[PDB]
A paper describes a structure:
Histidine triad nucleotide-binding proteins (HINTs) exhibit hydrolytic activity toward nucleoside phosphoramidates, such as tryptamine adenosine phosphoramidate (TrpA). While the biologically relevant substrates of [name] have not been clearly elucidated, the protein has been implicated in opioid receptor signaling, − regulation of the melanoma-associated transcription factor MITF, , and DNA damage repair. These functions position [name] as a potential pharmacological target for treating conditions such as opioid resistance or melanoma.
While these compounds initially appeared to demonstrate excellent selectivity for [name] over HDAC6, we unexpectedly observed dose-dependent competition of several other proteins in chemoproteomic competition experiments. These compounds also bound to [name] and NME4, and, with lower affinity, HINT2 and a protein ambiguously identified as [name] or NME2. The only reported [name]-targeting pharmacophores are nucleoside-based nonhydrolyzable substrate analogs, such as the carbamate TrpGC. ,, We evaluated the inhibitory potential of KV-24 and KV-30 in enzyme activity assays using recombinant [name]. Both compounds effectively inhibited [name] activity, with half-maximal inhibitory concentrations (IC50) of 12.3 μM for KV-24 and 12.6 μM for KV-30, which are comparable to the state-of-the-art [name] inhibitor TrpGC (IC50 = 9.1 μM). The structures revealed that the aromatic ring systems of KV-24 and KV-30 are buried in a hydrophobic cleft typically occupied by the base of the substrate nucleoside. This finding supports a competitive inhibition mode of action. Additionally, casein kinase 2 family members exhibited reduced binding at two-digit μM concentrations of KV-24. Interestingly, KV-24 showed dose-dependent binding to calcium/calmodulin-dependent 3′,5′-cyclic nucleotide phosphodiesterase 1C (PDE1C), with an affinity of approximately 2 μM. PDE1C is a cAMP/cGMP nucleotide-binding protein that features two divalent metal cation cofactors.
Residue numbers in the entry:
A (entry chain B): 15 to 126
B (entry chain A): 12 to 126
């Protein structure tokens, strides 16, 4: 059940990597919807947040902490929006869990 | 007054009413008063963290717990077709209350971009 995000983690295709550790990867979105638009993904293949396990909690929190640290480092001092999409109604484009982080512009309401 | 005195702190302490979905020792899930989708609820920590930008490293498991509770709640509410989770930070993010909150929206097709 491989995805393009699997290929990015395995370094088989190019991505502009912002941050990496032993358990996650942050990289700029190829189809950016704001001046800054990046993704934070687990290296573990969790297909969708709906199937995340209880013992994934820390890992999921880690994505958010890394995301907020990356945002600060990228100069997003007026704020930002974090997004996780699930399933068809959520508009989940890739069946590998991913945290979007968008900023550098006013984000509007509703959030889609 | 633990929880702070944002509206969310008052909800945690049952000083202001809310439509509560789920509660444990770490968090509270309740319906949003100005819903942007057929289902729209919030998951908040009971610990007052003002915004994600000031979360501590040791808040990781708590932040994770918000998402796990969010996904469980979405399932329990019958959002079978999916949903969108949102955290807003600061002015550009449209953050309305300075107590960290995970929005969970579903029951309709969500569009792109997410605002
Ligand atoms: O000024 C605001 N937004 O721009 C604002 C933000 C939050 C509340 C608010 N949100 C609630 C969400 C869920 C349940 C109860 C809520 N609530 C009660 C009183 C204010 C308020 C009201 C206004």
């Amino acid at each position: 059940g491989d995805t393009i995000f699997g290929k990015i983690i395995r370094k088989e295709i190019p991505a502009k990597i912002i941050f990496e550790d032993d358990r996650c990867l942050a990289f700029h979105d190829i189809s950016p919807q704001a001046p800054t638009h990046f993704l934070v993904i687990p290296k573990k293949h969790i297909s969708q947040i709906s199937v995340a396990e209880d013992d994934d909690e820390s890992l999921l929190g880690h994505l958010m902490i890394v995301g907020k640290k990356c945002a600060a480092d990228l100069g997003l001092n007026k704020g930002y929006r974090m997004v996780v999409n699930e399933g068809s109604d959520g508009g989940q484009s890739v069946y590998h869990v991913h945290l979007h982080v968008l900023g550098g512009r006013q984000m509007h309401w509703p959030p889609g």
